Scaffold this active site. Structure first.
Site, PDB file in Angstrom:
ATOM      1  N   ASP A 145       1.023  -1.066  -0.123  1.00 52.19           N
ATOM      2  CA  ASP A 145      -0.521  -0.109  -0.256  1.00 52.19           C
ATOM      3  C   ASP A 145       1.000   1.310  -0.135  1.00 52.19           C
ATOM      4  O   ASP A 145       1.721   1.145  -0.823  1.00 52.19           O
ATOM      5  CB  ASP A 145      -0.805   0.028   1.751  1.00 52.19           C
ATOM      6  CG  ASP A 145      -2.301   0.610   1.122  1.00 52.19           C
ATOM      7  OD1 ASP A 145      -3.298   0.779   0.192  1.00 52.19           O
ATOM      8  OD2 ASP A 145      -2.553   1.526   1.399  1.00 52.19           O
TER       9      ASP A 145
ATOM     10  N   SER B  44     -10.767  -2.203  -0.118  1.00 50.93           N
ATOM     11  CA  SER B  44      -9.242  -2.381   0.985  1.00 50.93           C
ATOM     12  C   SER B  44      -9.628  -2.981   2.442  1.00 50.93           C
ATOM     13  O   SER B  44      -8.662  -4.044   3.129  1.00 50.93           O
ATOM     14  CB  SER B  44      -8.774  -1.210   0.838  1.00 50.93           C
ATOM     15  OG  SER B  44      -8.181  -0.908   0.148  1.00 50.93           O
TER      16      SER B  44
ATOM     17  N   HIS C  48      -3.887   5.743   4.363  1.00 48.45           N
ATOM     18  CA  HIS C  48      -4.367   4.549   3.813  1.00 48.45           C
ATOM     19  C   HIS C  48      -3.436   2.952   4.099  1.00 48.45           C
ATOM     20  O   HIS C  48      -4.660   2.279   4.869  1.00 48.45           O
ATOM     21  CB  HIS C  48      -4.537   4.500   2.227  1.00 48.45           C
ATOM     22  CG  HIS C  48      -5.246   3.678   2.197  1.00 48.45           C
ATOM     23  ND1 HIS C  48      -5.487   2.741   1.155  1.00 48.45           N
ATOM     24  CD2 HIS C  48      -6.691   3.530   1.767  1.00 48.45           C
ATOM     25  CE1 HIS C  48      -5.725   1.614   1.180  1.00 48.45           C
ATOM     26  NE2 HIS C  48      -6.713   2.321   1.149  1.00 48.45           N
TER      27      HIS C  48
END
Ligand SMILES: COc1cc2c(cc1OC)[C@@](C)(CC(=O)Nc1nccs1)NCC2
Lengths: 92, 486
Positions: free
Chosen positions: B26, B219, B59
């Site tokens: 990521d 996700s 994230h």
């Protein structure tokens, strides 16, 4: 036998950067030689190419920063299975 | 007190990740965050595109938290390794992701460890090279978990979401409904394996070492499955990719998602499964899953083909058309393994090949074919040998227009029987007939559906939904083959 592929999502496309994927059992030495061959044949045509990365471990091949004009020349190279134009990936 | 998402994945009976390592590809991560402190090793790998300080780590930190988090994580205190393939805006390249996946394999070859779980919480358009890289990494013995996508579209048009070897996860909310990310939302279709909590998911926040943030997306959903798989592999380290996939499907919650949110044609293809950890109980049990092929199209020669995993056995084959214009289905052998092929008729938009893929070790399976008899009795074939059980019936006709261990078909059509030599297996045929658009017949608890077919008057097709056989029409009789371990 070798085919070319590019992302169907036009804004996610990255022209100028290509992933050259070679045949299933192509060795690392052959992969590097095919990359240097491309650079040599492209230098004769007056095009500047850059080998950004050489793949081995999962798939045989290399990442080349070149003009699209050399794609027909690159598809004719030995061991070439398929060439793909790089594209964007995004955090979900 | 307990976050909604962690309660949904908790099975109706219950009591990790030291033995299993989880790789995350990521953005950059705040390794110093108390939720993931000392259990996440930043490889400092970088192959990100040029941006056009705390917002960067946003994230990745949340996902590392959803997976290994001490207080809000799925697999509490699991060993994690993060690779940066996405920039500050959460953007990356296919090439960078390829180098990222190659690094994991190179790391695995240099210093081998136990089971490996790779979380790919990203998506781009369909990519031949990315799907091929995912295939080869899975062949090596690596578990790949990916996000379905947040584009409210078919997951098959996105990568690594469409790579057949990976575990594609869609997102669901507290009401078990598909997540709506503003204008868009979760992806769907035959490429999605299952769904997992993906709305109002609390996890580690990059703002401060103790801070928490709530995030939504496929996700977050994929992070739950990566954590569930890490624990499943912690309990059973010998699990193969086909074994783990079958476990995830079997232990998932059934028929909880309201199919209404998805487009009509995608409602059936999309699996109504919500991820959950396995219960305390689980000898050997029979695991089966429903695989749907890619739509054949308007070509009569080009046919829809549904395949199974190399360590998975095809026990049945069926076909579907929303118009009902088809030339049946066949269980044809290809390269030493059985495939499910569906044929299309004149005027038909296309057909689907629906196969039932099962984990059947220490058993020998074969296909018994019979061409049209052209007589009043109808086309018949049976499992003649003793110790053999009928698992599925297939029927295809080259014509333009029209008992235990035995397959019965139409006089102008060919018939295919699937016979298996499994001594520790008990099989039964359950039937239901009504004089109506849909007829259903379901296997009882402890019994796994192996074959779904329609008794031969016009039928749209037949398909298996978990352990229920569904037959579509405009009498009509649904035939279900239920098997179990004795
Ligand atoms: C492009 O086609 C597919 C793509 C995908 C999947 C399934 C697909 O087709 C059925 C599933 C659901 C997995 C799956 O079942 N795998 C299989 N391997 C061999 C035969 S099935 N998730 C990943 C994407």
């Amino acid at each position: 036998t070798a085919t070319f592929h590019r992302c169907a999502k036009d804004p996610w496309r990255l022209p100028g950067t290509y992933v050259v994927v070679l045949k299933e059992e192509t060795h690392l030495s052959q992969s590097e030689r095919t990359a240097r061959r491309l650079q040599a044949q492209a230098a004769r045509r007056g095009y500047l190419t850059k080998i950004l990365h050489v793949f081995h471990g999962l798939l045989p091949g290399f990442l080349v920063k070149m003009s699209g004009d050399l794609l027909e020349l690159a598809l004719k190279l030995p061991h070439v299975d398929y060439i793909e134009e790089d594209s964007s990936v995004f955090a979900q």
